[PDB]
């Protein structure tokens, strides 16, 4: 994945998730994408209430993009693999 400052355009299914989180732009840095994804998970309360590094994304549009039912913030490879599939590097 590109570093810092590099601009990316999310594909439509990812952009729809970012829009729920309040994103109004079409072009982002990777860090900004991560900011909106964190906001989305928070707003939808997908994190496990007791073990808050675990995110339960089954039965949510985010799980359809990640292709996993749950993930750990400490093992974020599924998130970055999803971003590689869903970001156009500008």
């Amino acid at each position: 994945l590109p570093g810092e400052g590099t601009q990316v355009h999310p594909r439509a299914p990812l952009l729809q998730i970012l829009k729920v989180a309040g994103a109004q732009e079409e072009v982002f840095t990777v860090k900004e994408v991560m900011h909106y994804l964190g906001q989305y998970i928070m707003m939808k309360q997908l994190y496990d209430k007791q073990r808050q590094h675990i995110v339960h994304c089954h039965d949510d549009p985010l799980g359809e993009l990640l292709e996993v039912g749950s993930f750990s913030v400490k093992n974020p490879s599924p998130l970055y693999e999803m971003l590689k599939r869903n970001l156009v590097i500008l």
Binding site: M34, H35, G38, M42, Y47, Q52, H53, V55, V73
Partner: peptide, 14 residues
Amino acid sequence: QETFXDLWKLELEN
């Protein structure tokens, strides 16, 4: 006892 917000921020900023 760390919150999801703090854990995600740690990753985001790393």
